[PDB]
């Protein structure tokens, strides 16, 4: 087999080989035998010189259009002479040149990756095309510097490279939602030729954040006289997720007792906590309960918060006077110290607001004695004479130590007999 | 201050204290002084024995109805004597007993936790109620043995416990979707009393699985004569998620070239890959393309798979005989060795299916000569005499080396002249 190598895309008139010498034809015989290539197609690309007997390129040859991705491109040639008419055979090897640069069919590649994609997941990329073969084909892929993505290039069944995008670090759309990358494919030509593609990565949102309250817990003070409809506090919570998944609404915890719901209500949009009814420090001095903020995701994320409402005592009770026992009538002969009445006082308020003092006018022949807390006896403190006064209206005044103090008035009526 | 402790729910006649001796009353004069409890309410629960002067329980006292959740329960008592008329005061401390067991308001508690909940996330639980106070109130919560959940119990300023369920290890609904737990609350009484609640936690599904092919790649061999509509392979992929997120459908990759789409089709539900048109080993010997499986989730998860289809050569071409040149007429005086015809053969099949041998009948005065691959010249091999035979019909037979071989027949017609 006579084999001539010649590079593809060679100019018209390029020397391939001297077939006349290799077929053992005489030079003078060459001008007579009129050696020519047989076959209509091959006459477009090859020609035989009548003077030298050289096989020459007629029209440039494209190896890619002829053999595609085959490793070797060999063109069998047949020749004809006259006198006598004879046929000869030779093979022309078309040697590949690097007339193709790597090129991605689309130069804009867009990937949408979920925010919760696990590191180690591979994402396919469309590979560049290089119609050349051998070392002139694609030799490596490159990915521009970044912090979350790397390249994982796989070799498929024939030995072509298949590039895949590999997630190295977890994503977080709340920190970075978009990545702009450049992907490069380079062949092993001399010099290497390359082509690039722009890779835009989008991070899709997951509902991975619960709402966050402004403070971890709230403690509030309110006077027990506060009217219904007063705003105690406005709860604020934020959620960084997108759309309804970042939309915060407020409510009581599911386990909130009705004793809380009776006095407090929570506006679902504004988070304003209002007072719904009368408070009373004397019955309950504080309330502890939990509230929650929910996002509008499906399903929803929840966050709880602890609320404490402290009541402040108000001096809303005047002292209560109990006259336990009462003489009614007293002999004018009674010795000083005679008990006229037993008196008890109570004030339900706290601290100084509930501390009671008792008094009567000085000018009376009576006095107040106390042996135990909040207990007073009304006794005679001087002599009595019916002819002077037949009866006494003894004005008793109880007062608490609030500011200002509140007073209670009670009159003990006492008849005097002989 | 005279203070007597007495446990709540004590029977009638229980000894509280010797008030007379603490009030410093003469022992011989009790029947005269007639020490008595003052106040209608306190007279329902306490009475003074006239002979001994001891304060006794009349009707049993409920500490819970009196003080609720307060730590200390103190009842001021007032007493009255006659001869002389006097008032005395003492305090009774009502001591809590352990007459309340812990009790959850609901015996069935249900939690729905997302499969992708991060470890360390907390979930509220409805606390049990124990109306007692002090050591008789709830002292600890317990959670049955398990591997993913623990308790995080918070202590408030008054001593109330707030139980929270704490996720310790990551969940996976594809491995276990339901957890059955019992939650227990115990007080610190002697003996300790407790109550339980049934806790059912369910794991909600996330679309965290892409479909999985049975094999990482498939390689198929098919004869180039295979008829249209033949099933080459059935792709199988599973997706363990729930609902549409676990429903798999098949398709070609988005970038699949039309030369592939023209010959192969993929049923979206069954995954059967069928043949759509004629194959030809002589023009194309293999096809490589990617297929994908998508679930019905929103957004959809997909996994790609690489397919390679290799064609097998069939002996579907008999050799082709080309008679390049033919003398047609020959003089009987011509010397042996004269070339009568030029013959080239070709068979497009590969291997033994494409190797051609040539022959002619033995008895003829002709022979076949070959100087180049697949080129034969028909020459005279003996003397020729016109008077004997004026013309020859030379039967040339080409055969390939297939089993069974395929043959081609061509006759060279030759006239002889004088
Ligand atoms: C993707 O997945 C698909 C589906 O997978 C299946 O379905 C899913 C849902 C799962 O359950 C999965 O586990 C399943 O596998 C899968 O396609 C299947 O591929 C299988 C092979 O890989 C194939 O199995 C064959 O089934 C034949 C019967 O099928 C009939 O019934 C089924 C179910 O009802 C129908 O779908 C189907 O259309 C048919 O109607 C079965 O006969 C084959 O076994 C014979 O052949 C074997 C090798 O060819 C051989 O090893 C076996 O031993 C058996 O050989 C026969 O043995 C009997 C008894 O010994 C002989 O009978 C006796 O003969 C003696 C004389 O010899 C005497 O006459 C006695 O009297 C007589 O009883 C008989 O002669 C033997 N035959 C031969 C030819 O030798 C084989 O098991 C499934 O059908 C496929 N399913 C479908 C739905 O198509 C794909 O493979 C997966 N894809 C990939 C890429 O893997
Ligand atoms: C939950 O969030 C809400 C809302 O938050 C606000 O909106 C968010 C979108 C975001 O932007 C966030 O940053 C905002 O703060 C909270 O409610 C807000 O609370 C703050 C603080 O408690 C209040 O600020 C006060 O604003 C008034 C003016 O408010 C008028 O105009 C507002 C619009 O700009 C309206 O929204 C109001 O309705 C009202 O019409 C200021 O006057 C206050 O400053 C003065 O008083 C404080 C002490 O209270 C002093 O420290 C300051 O120095 C100011 O004093 C004045 O100074 C001038 C000049 O020196 C002097 O001439 C005056 O005499 C001084 N006056 C006095 C009285 O000394 C505050 O800045 C917001 O009004 C309130 N907004 C709403 C809508 O309610 C809420 O607190 C939060 N929840 C929790 C638990 O934190
Ligand atoms: C939340 O939902 C309401 C309707 O309920 C809508 O008007 C609002 O725009 C949404 N987003 C925010 C941030 O409030
Ligand atoms: C997928 O959805 C279709 C809708 O009709 C249903 O018929 C089919 O059974 C589903 N897939 C599986 C694997 O069940
Ligand atoms: C692509 O890459 C090749 C090799 O790195 C370069 O030679 C070319 O200029 C292009 O940048
Ligand atoms: C790679 O770089 C080329 C320019 O060399 C661009 O055309 C391409 O879009 C990518 O950025
Ligand atoms: C709750 O726990 C207490 C103390 O462990 C038991 O006595 C009771 O039976 C219940 O199981
Ligand atoms: C805890 O266990 C008790 C039985 O000891 C049940 O009655 C209760 O409902 C919970 O399961
Ligand atoms: Ca070319
Ligand atoms: Ca080339
Ligand atoms: Ca190239
Ligand atoms: Ca995030
Ligand atoms: Ca998010
Ligand atoms: Ca959210
Ligand atoms: Ca009050
Ligand atoms: Ca008060
Ligand atoms: Ca008061
Ligand atoms: Ca009780
Ligand atoms: Ca208890
Ligand atoms: Ca109790
Ligand atoms: Ca899972
Ligand atoms: Ca899942
Ligand atoms: Ca899935
Ligand atoms: Ca064929
Ligand atoms: Ca064939
Ligand atoms: Ca053949
Ligand atoms: Cl590479
Ligand atoms: Cl609510
Ligand atoms: Cl009274
Ligand atoms: Cl009065
Ligand atoms: Cl006495
Ligand atoms: Cl009594
Ligand atoms: Cl505990």
mmCIF file with all atom_site columns, C-alpha atoms in Angstrom, chain A residues 1-2 23 69 77-80 85-91 106 121-122 124-126 156-158 160 162 204 210 219 254-255 257 286 288-290 299 301-302 304 306 308 322 324-327 339-345 371-377, chain B residues 2 23 38 77-81 84-91 106 114 118 121-127 154 156-158 160 162 164 204 208 210 217 219 255 286 288-290 299 301-304 306 308 324-326 339 342 344-345 372-375:
data_model
loop_
_atom_site.group_PDB
_atom_site.id
_atom_site.type_symbol
_atom_site.label_atom_id
_atom_site.label_alt_id
_atom_site.label_comp_id
_atom_site.label_asym_id
_atom_site.label_entity_id
_atom_site.label_seq_id
_atom_site.pdbx_PDB_ins_code
_atom_site.Cartn_x
_atom_site.Cartn_y
_atom_site.Cartn_z
_atom_site.occupancy
_atom_site.B_iso_or_equiv
_atom_site.pdbx_formal_charge
_atom_site.auth_seq_id
_atom_site.auth_comp_id
_atom_site.auth_asym_id
_atom_site.auth_atom_id
_atom_site.pdbx_PDB_model_num
ATOM 1   C CA . UNK A 1 1   ? 0.000   0.000  0.000   1.00 0.00 ? 1   UNK A CA 1
ATOM 2   C CA . UNK A 1 2   ? 1.400   3.346  -1.113  1.00 0.00 ? 2   UNK A CA 1
ATOM 3   C CA . UNK A 1 23  ? 3.868   3.058  -9.929  1.00 0.00 ? 23  UNK A CA 1
ATOM 4   C CA . UNK A 1 69  ? -14.499 12.344 14.520  1.00 0.00 ? 69  UNK A CA 1
ATOM 5   C CA . UNK A 1 77  ? -7.262  6.784  -4.856  1.00 0.00 ? 77  UNK A CA 1
ATOM 6   C CA . UNK A 1 78  ? -7.472  4.951  -8.188  1.00 0.00 ? 78  UNK A CA 1
ATOM 7   C CA . UNK A 1 79  ? -5.557  6.013  -11.302 1.00 0.00 ? 79  UNK A CA 1
ATOM 8   C CA . UNK A 1 80  ? -5.852  5.412  -15.050 1.00 0.00 ? 80  UNK A CA 1
ATOM 9   C CA . UNK A 1 85  ? -5.013  1.180  -20.297 1.00 0.00 ? 85  UNK A CA 1
ATOM 10  C CA . UNK A 1 86  ? -4.086  0.302  -16.704 1.00 0.00 ? 86  UNK A CA 1
ATOM 11  C CA . UNK A 1 87  ? -5.323  1.016  -13.180 1.00 0.00 ? 87  UNK A CA 1
ATOM 12  C CA . UNK A 1 88  ? -3.288  1.709  -10.038 1.00 0.00 ? 88  UNK A CA 1
ATOM 13  C CA . UNK A 1 89  ? -4.110  2.259  -6.359  1.00 0.00 ? 89  UNK A CA 1
ATOM 14  C CA . UNK A 1 90  ? -2.752  4.495  -3.607  1.00 0.00 ? 90  UNK A CA 1
ATOM 15  C CA . UNK A 1 91  ? -3.921  5.823  -0.244  1.00 0.00 ? 91  UNK A CA 1
ATOM 16  C CA . UNK A 1 106 ? -24.778 28.625 23.931  1.00 0.00 ? 106 UNK A CA 1
ATOM 17  C CA . UNK A 1 121 ? -24.257 17.430 44.348  1.00 0.00 ? 121 UNK A CA 1
ATOM 18  C CA . UNK A 1 122 ? -23.263 17.607 40.686  1.00 0.00 ? 122 UNK A CA 1
ATOM 19  C CA . UNK A 1 124 ? -24.735 19.052 34.391  1.00 0.00 ? 124 UNK A CA 1
ATOM 20  C CA . UNK A 1 125 ? -23.225 21.609 32.049  1.00 0.00 ? 125 UNK A CA 1
ATOM 21  C CA . UNK A 1 126 ? -23.458 21.512 28.271  1.00 0.00 ? 126 UNK A CA 1
ATOM 22  C CA . UNK A 1 156 ? -17.437 9.359  28.880  1.00 0.00 ? 156 UNK A CA 1
ATOM 23  C CA . UNK A 1 157 ? -17.359 6.120  26.909  1.00 0.00 ? 157 UNK A CA 1
ATOM 24  C CA . UNK A 1 158 ? -15.291 7.339  23.943  1.00 0.00 ? 158 UNK A CA 1
ATOM 25  C CA . UNK A 1 160 ? -14.510 12.919 25.499  1.00 0.00 ? 160 UNK A CA 1
ATOM 26  C CA . UNK A 1 162 ? -18.055 15.845 30.230  1.00 0.00 ? 162 UNK A CA 1
ATOM 27  C CA . UNK A 1 204 ? -33.947 29.736 44.793  1.00 0.00 ? 204 UNK A CA 1
ATOM 28  C CA . UNK A 1 210 ? -38.333 31.388 61.369  1.00 0.00 ? 210 UNK A CA 1
ATOM 29  C CA . UNK A 1 219 ? -41.579 42.501 80.673  1.00 0.00 ? 219 UNK A CA 1
ATOM 30  C CA . UNK A 1 254 ? -51.925 27.370 71.202  1.00 0.00 ? 254 UNK A CA 1
ATOM 31  C CA . UNK A 1 255 ? -51.731 26.435 74.895  1.00 0.00 ? 255 UNK A CA 1
ATOM 32  C CA . UNK A 1 257 ? -55.311 29.657 78.987  1.00 0.00 ? 257 UNK A CA 1
ATOM 33  C CA . UNK A 1 286 ? -48.812 39.522 87.258  1.00 0.00 ? 286 UNK A CA 1
ATOM 34  C CA . UNK A 1 288 ? -46.902 35.268 82.223  1.00 0.00 ? 288 UNK A CA 1
ATOM 35  C CA . UNK A 1 289 ? -47.709 33.862 78.780  1.00 0.00 ? 289 UNK A CA 1
ATOM 36  C CA . UNK A 1 290 ? -46.147 33.058 75.414  1.00 0.00 ? 290 UNK A CA 1
ATOM 37  C CA . UNK A 1 299 ? -45.873 24.855 56.003  1.00 0.00 ? 299 UNK A CA 1
ATOM 38  C CA . UNK A 1 301 ? -42.153 28.367 60.563  1.00 0.00 ? 301 UNK A CA 1
ATOM 39  C CA . UNK A 1 302 ? -42.831 29.438 64.157  1.00 0.00 ? 302 UNK A CA 1
ATOM 40  C CA . UNK A 1 304 ? -42.211 31.856 70.422  1.00 0.00 ? 304 UNK A CA 1
ATOM 41  C CA . UNK A 1 306 ? -42.204 35.080 76.587  1.00 0.00 ? 306 UNK A CA 1
ATOM 42  C CA . UNK A 1 308 ? -44.682 39.170 81.376  1.00 0.00 ? 308 UNK A CA 1
ATOM 43  C CA . UNK A 1 322 ? -66.146 46.703 111.441 1.00 0.00 ? 322 UNK A CA 1
ATOM 44  C CA . UNK A 1 324 ? -67.771 44.050 116.316 1.00 0.00 ? 324 UNK A CA 1
ATOM 45  C CA . UNK A 1 325 ? -69.563 44.766 119.609 1.00 0.00 ? 325 UNK A CA 1
ATOM 46  C CA . UNK A 1 326 ? -71.323 47.894 120.805 1.00 0.00 ? 326 UNK A CA 1
ATOM 47  C CA . UNK A 1 327 ? -72.690 48.788 124.232 1.00 0.00 ? 327 UNK A CA 1
ATOM 48  C CA . UNK A 1 339 ? -65.134 49.323 126.905 1.00 0.00 ? 339 UNK A CA 1
ATOM 49  C CA . UNK A 1 340 ? -67.801 50.952 124.732 1.00 0.00 ? 340 UNK A CA 1
ATOM 50  C CA . UNK A 1 341 ? -67.094 49.246 121.395 1.00 0.00 ? 341 UNK A CA 1
ATOM 51  C CA . UNK A 1 342 ? -64.705 46.846 119.681 1.00 0.00 ? 342 UNK A CA 1
ATOM 52  C CA . UNK A 1 343 ? -63.480 48.050 116.281 1.00 0.00 ? 343 UNK A CA 1
ATOM 53  C CA . UNK A 1 344 ? -61.600 46.227 113.512 1.00 0.00 ? 344 UNK A CA 1
ATOM 54  C CA . UNK A 1 345 ? -60.187 47.813 110.356 1.00 0.00 ? 345 UNK A CA 1
ATOM 55  C CA . UNK A 1 371 ? -53.453 45.711 121.711 1.00 0.00 ? 371 UNK A CA 1
ATOM 56  C CA . UNK A 1 372 ? -53.231 43.873 118.372 1.00 0.00 ? 372 UNK A CA 1
ATOM 57  C CA . UNK A 1 373 ? -52.752 44.800 114.736 1.00 0.00 ? 373 UNK A CA 1
ATOM 58  C CA . UNK A 1 374 ? -55.805 46.512 113.205 1.00 0.00 ? 374 UNK A CA 1
ATOM 59  C CA . UNK A 1 375 ? -57.787 46.022 116.439 1.00 0.00 ? 375 UNK A CA 1
ATOM 60  C CA . UNK A 1 376 ? -59.062 48.959 118.507 1.00 0.00 ? 376 UNK A CA 1
ATOM 61  C CA . UNK A 1 377 ? -61.332 49.263 121.541 1.00 0.00 ? 377 UNK A CA 1
ATOM 62  C CA . UNK B 2 2   ? -49.100 34.202 117.324 1.00 0.00 ? 2   UNK B CA 1
ATOM 63  C CA . UNK B 2 23  ? -53.405 35.014 125.050 1.00 0.00 ? 23  UNK B CA 1
ATOM 64  C CA . UNK B 2 38  ? -65.339 36.415 115.698 1.00 0.00 ? 38  UNK B CA 1
ATOM 65  C CA . UNK B 2 77  ? -58.237 35.217 113.142 1.00 0.00 ? 77  UNK B CA 1
ATOM 66  C CA . UNK B 2 78  ? -60.049 37.511 115.569 1.00 0.00 ? 78  UNK B CA 1
ATOM 67  C CA . UNK B 2 79  ? -61.258 36.473 119.018 1.00 0.00 ? 79  UNK B CA 1
ATOM 68  C CA . UNK B 2 80  ? -63.621 38.063 121.542 1.00 0.00 ? 80  UNK B CA 1
ATOM 69  C CA . UNK B 2 81  ? -63.999 37.734 125.311 1.00 0.00 ? 81  UNK B CA 1
ATOM 70  C CA . UNK B 2 84  ? -64.078 42.562 130.383 1.00 0.00 ? 84  UNK B CA 1
ATOM 71  C CA . UNK B 2 85  ? -64.916 42.917 126.686 1.00 0.00 ? 85  UNK B CA 1
ATOM 72  C CA . UNK B 2 86  ? -61.679 42.256 124.788 1.00 0.00 ? 86  UNK B CA 1
ATOM 73  C CA . UNK B 2 87  ? -60.425 41.327 121.326 1.00 0.00 ? 87  UNK B CA 1
ATOM 74  C CA . UNK B 2 88  ? -57.465 39.108 120.433 1.00 0.00 ? 88  UNK B CA 1
ATOM 75  C CA . UNK B 2 89  ? -55.712 38.265 117.186 1.00 0.00 ? 89  UNK B CA 1
ATOM 76  C CA . UNK B 2 90  ? -53.836 35.266 115.792 1.00 0.00 ? 90  UNK B CA 1
ATOM 77  C CA . UNK B 2 91  ? -52.751 33.973 112.384 1.00 0.00 ? 91  UNK B CA 1
ATOM 78  C CA . UNK B 2 106 ? -55.015 17.129 76.804  1.00 0.00 ? 106 UNK B CA 1
ATOM 79  C CA . UNK B 2 114 ? -40.421 19.484 59.020  1.00 0.00 ? 114 UNK B CA 1
ATOM 80  C CA . UNK B 2 118 ? -32.108 21.897 62.055  1.00 0.00 ? 118 UNK B CA 1
ATOM 81  C CA . UNK B 2 121 ? -34.616 23.630 67.254  1.00 0.00 ? 121 UNK B CA 1
ATOM 82  C CA . UNK B 2 122 ? -37.146 23.689 70.080  1.00 0.00 ? 122 UNK B CA 1
ATOM 83  C CA . UNK B 2 123 ? -40.866 22.986 69.996  1.00 0.00 ? 123 UNK B CA 1
ATOM 84  C CA . UNK B 2 124 ? -43.318 24.021 72.733  1.00 0.00 ? 124 UNK B CA 1
ATOM 85  C CA . UNK B 2 125 ? -45.258 21.449 74.716  1.00 0.00 ? 125 UNK B CA 1
ATOM 86  C CA . UNK B 2 126 ? -48.438 21.979 76.693  1.00 0.00 ? 126 UNK B CA 1
ATOM 87  C CA . UNK B 2 127 ? -47.488 21.857 80.362  1.00 0.00 ? 127 UNK B CA 1
ATOM 88  C CA . UNK B 2 154 ? -37.228 26.199 81.656  1.00 0.00 ? 154 UNK B CA 1
ATOM 89  C CA . UNK B 2 156 ? -39.684 30.628 85.794  1.00 0.00 ? 156 UNK B CA 1
ATOM 90  C CA . UNK B 2 157 ? -39.351 33.070 88.682  1.00 0.00 ? 157 UNK B CA 1
ATOM 91  C CA . UNK B 2 158 ? -42.274 31.582 90.635  1.00 0.00 ? 158 UNK B CA 1
ATOM 92  C CA . UNK B 2 160 ? -43.203 26.931 87.196  1.00 0.00 ? 160 UNK B CA 1
ATOM 93  C CA . UNK B 2 162 ? -42.001 25.155 81.008  1.00 0.00 ? 162 UNK B CA 1
ATOM 94  C CA . UNK B 2 164 ? -39.840 22.181 75.455  1.00 0.00 ? 164 UNK B CA 1
ATOM 95  C CA . UNK B 2 204 ? -43.530 16.256 57.042  1.00 0.00 ? 204 UNK B CA 1
ATOM 96  C CA . UNK B 2 208 ? -35.074 16.281 49.085  1.00 0.00 ? 208 UNK B CA 1
ATOM 97  C CA . UNK B 2 210 ? -34.005 13.367 43.030  1.00 0.00 ? 210 UNK B CA 1
ATOM 98  C CA . UNK B 2 217 ? -25.126 4.339  32.822  1.00 0.00 ? 217 UNK B CA 1
ATOM 99  C CA . UNK B 2 219 ? -24.782 0.391  27.247  1.00 0.00 ? 219 UNK B CA 1
ATOM 100 C CA . UNK B 2 255 ? -29.693 19.703 24.568  1.00 0.00 ? 255 UNK B CA 1
ATOM 101 C CA . UNK B 2 286 ? -22.908 4.362  17.744  1.00 0.00 ? 286 UNK B CA 1
ATOM 102 C CA . UNK B 2 288 ? -24.365 8.683  22.876  1.00 0.00 ? 288 UNK B CA 1
ATOM 103 C CA . UNK B 2 289 ? -26.924 10.935 24.546  1.00 0.00 ? 289 UNK B CA 1
ATOM 104 C CA . UNK B 2 290 ? -28.234 11.831 27.988  1.00 0.00 ? 290 UNK B CA 1
ATOM 105 C CA . UNK B 2 299 ? -39.655 22.882 41.646  1.00 0.00 ? 299 UNK B CA 1
ATOM 106 C CA . UNK B 2 301 ? -35.714 17.524 40.967  1.00 0.00 ? 301 UNK B CA 1
ATOM 107 C CA . UNK B 2 302 ? -33.960 15.827 38.068  1.00 0.00 ? 302 UNK B CA 1
ATOM 108 C CA . UNK B 2 303 ? -31.199 13.271 37.594  1.00 0.00 ? 303 UNK B CA 1
ATOM 109 C CA . UNK B 2 304 ? -29.457 12.587 34.297  1.00 0.00 ? 304 UNK B CA 1
ATOM 110 C CA . UNK B 2 306 ? -25.871 8.548  30.023  1.00 0.00 ? 306 UNK B CA 1
ATOM 111 C CA . UNK B 2 308 ? -24.703 4.576  24.609  1.00 0.00 ? 308 UNK B CA 1
ATOM 112 C CA . UNK B 2 324 ? -13.567 -0.391 -15.268 1.00 0.00 ? 324 UNK B CA 1
ATOM 113 C CA . UNK B 2 325 ? -12.539 -1.108 -18.864 1.00 0.00 ? 325 UNK B CA 1
ATOM 114 C CA . UNK B 2 326 ? -13.338 -3.873 -21.340 1.00 0.00 ? 326 UNK B CA 1
ATOM 115 C CA . UNK B 2 339 ? -5.362  -7.813 -20.309 1.00 0.00 ? 339 UNK B CA 1
ATOM 116 C CA . UNK B 2 342 ? -10.120 -4.159 -15.506 1.00 0.00 ? 342 UNK B CA 1
ATOM 117 C CA . UNK B 2 344 ? -12.500 -3.471 -9.064  1.00 0.00 ? 344 UNK B CA 1
ATOM 118 C CA . UNK B 2 345 ? -14.615 -4.876 -6.236  1.00 0.00 ? 345 UNK B CA 1
ATOM 119 C CA . UNK B 2 372 ? -3.456  -3.778 -5.854  1.00 0.00 ? 372 UNK B CA 1
ATOM 120 C CA . UNK B 2 373 ? -6.030  -4.330 -3.131  1.00 0.00 ? 373 UNK B CA 1
ATOM 121 C CA . UNK B 2 374 ? -9.461  -5.258 -4.562  1.00 0.00 ? 374 UNK B CA 1
ATOM 122 C CA . UNK B 2 375 ? -8.302  -4.642 -8.158  1.00 0.00 ? 375 UNK B CA 1
#
